[model samples]
Target: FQSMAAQMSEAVAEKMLQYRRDTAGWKICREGNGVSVSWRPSVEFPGNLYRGEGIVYGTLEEVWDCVKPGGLRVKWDENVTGFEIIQSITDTLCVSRTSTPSAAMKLISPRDFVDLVLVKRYEDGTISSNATHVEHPLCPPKPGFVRGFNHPCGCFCEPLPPTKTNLVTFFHTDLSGYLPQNVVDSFFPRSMTRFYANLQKAVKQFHE
Candidate 1:
């Protein structure tokens, strides 16, 4: 199994080089024909993260349809757990999380909510360990143990609509901001380019 896994990993790595070359604006085409490649640009939420605070929770596949095109919303259904849908608007983004009564009470002072708790990191490493005690208007109740759900130490029950609250003005950066300009440029180094070019050539040769 280990040997097979290693081989599969190598195969995947080889394919990834071809994928990066394709997406980085370079295309391989026959001289006369223009081919249209169709692909969807979508981001998947990590698994088992709950929406809003309490009522709904589920895996990305389970809650994918709940996500809207240009707006953020949360949805709940009996068959699956809930999750929050955040959307990009202008240059900013919005987010909503599930919450409980106690969590809601903590949000009375919005500034205090943001400073003391909302920004706190609850998990050490694993997602299950995530929790914050500082109050935010939007925090759902501490979660209880559901049949298949694993509640980390600080999670609470979910919150409902009317009770649901909006948290505006959160800010963060994307990949371009996180990486230095020099490092970004290094990504297209000649050696890396040649590595991928060779890979695509080999794939074509294999087919021939």
Candidate 2:
């Protein structure tokens, strides 16, 4: 079982790299606040796939420390309320549950996701954590929270030198429930912009 999970995770991690290299099908949706978001129509998922790109004022190691699963993200990421490891596939791969608070004037309710996450370090000095929705025996949808499905999503950090890192993140969440089209469309751009802004603050504090 561990072997299977590891292979699957590694495959997804590779795909994330490919997504970065192959810009086909992606169209710029929004750009502001030092972050640019692009979208491509998803054939499988219920919503459009999104990619967010930005340059953070920190080294790759510093940015990765806050991006990977742990207490650092809990303290810095406003959308993340809680995270729990359901099972560990390896030191860098695990099945986990992430909880998020409601957003967009409560149109998007509190949501939870159980996913197989792979944290990988590339030979090119890049770090990425790719995750996809998974059904884990240990994690079940909890009451009072909408179970969300993230389709091949996570963040990638590449070293840009000069104490800077290029950050790219992906989001294709099916926040299951009733949500207006405008609400869903407006959410990612605004949220992604704030994400970079908040990350900049976190990295600044870390260096201080």
Candidate 3:
């Protein structure tokens, strides 16, 4: 697990896991919350969507603590009905059932996932987390939930020196397998806004 996480984190560390944009259909947004989420849907899947590193005024330890098991629901998970670790691989990794977007579009229900969540605290004290769907002996696909195949994602945290504050963000994870393009186009911006807003609030609260 650790080695796998290392391979994944190195890509992010080297600036290899970033989105590209073109002239056509480009869009950007920031609505008073200090979060800057962007997308270029002309491209397909993973290349198409991402959120920038929104600042949070808190110690890295505090922010990291908020991401432990049960962390999402308590802090930044406004859209999720539930997120829980069903299987533990380590203090920083797990396999879980999660509903990140909470509700789904018509005929497009939220997914039930068993994903590998591997995290690393790098030597320079930065943080990285990689999550991707994987089959599990304990978690077989069930009716009414998308198995969340092919929706791998990750997060990186860059800290500010001499201060406890950090800028945290998610690189794009395209959950487009089961939903129509129009539906996803409408759903994700709303979801990412709420996600970052909640995280900012939670981190500040934890800082206090």
Candidate 4:
């Protein structure tokens, strides 16, 4: 499991670097409140992939702690209804599950996903928690829950010196089940904007 997880993490690290460096093919989705989100049709999936950028006030360590597992992300991440680690492969790699409540006025019903999460560090001092959907015998689909899948997705926390961090996020999730095209198209940008807005406050609260 460790070897497989390590290989996957290496690939994800490279993919994340590509996502940040390559700017082609992205269409503007939403921008405001010091955050900008964009999306493009995913080559790997049927729906769109999203990318977001913003600066949050806090040291990189502080910001990373809040975003990583065992921190306060579940508290302020509005979309997340539950987070649990099913198995720990290592300190930096684990199998986890995340659940989300219904959205768009419940037109989208409750959903959950299981993923392999890898915490990786880069030569440039960037910290990231990469995730991709993976099945585990311990976690199975429950009644009244749609099993969603997340492609290579995660957050990048880059130190900006003193008291701020440059944060970049990307995710391409397959929210399984039927839905109106308009609802699917409109949900991501708005969801990400609120993500950053709440993250800013969470960082402030981290110091308290």
Highest lDDT: which candidate? 4
Q: Comparing 2 and 3 by TM-score, which wins?
A: 2
lDDT of each: 0.23, 0.85, 0.59, 0.87
* lDDT (tens digit, per residue) of candidate 1 on 71-148: 222222111133332221112122223321111223211111111111111132111112111223454333441112
Q: Clashing residue pairs, candidate 4?
A: none
Q: Which run of 10 residues does model 3 get worst, by summed lDDT?
A: 15-24
Q: How many collisions between residues are there in candidate 4? A: 0
In angstroms, give how far residue 52 of model 4 lies from its true place. Answer: 0.5
Per-residue C-alpha lDDT of model 4 across residues 1-208, encoded as one tens digit per residue: 5687789867876787788888899999878788999998887688988999999988898888878965577788899988998888887888889989999989999999998888988877999978889888999998999999988888999987456899999977889788778898888889889889988988888678
The TM-score of candidate 4 is 0.95
Candidate 2 residue-wise lDDT, 39-110, digit = tens? 888754768888899999887888888888755777878899999888877988988899999999988899
Worst 10 residues of 1 by lDDT: 167-176
lDDT head-to-head 2 vs 3, winner:
2
Local lDDT at 100 for model 2: 91
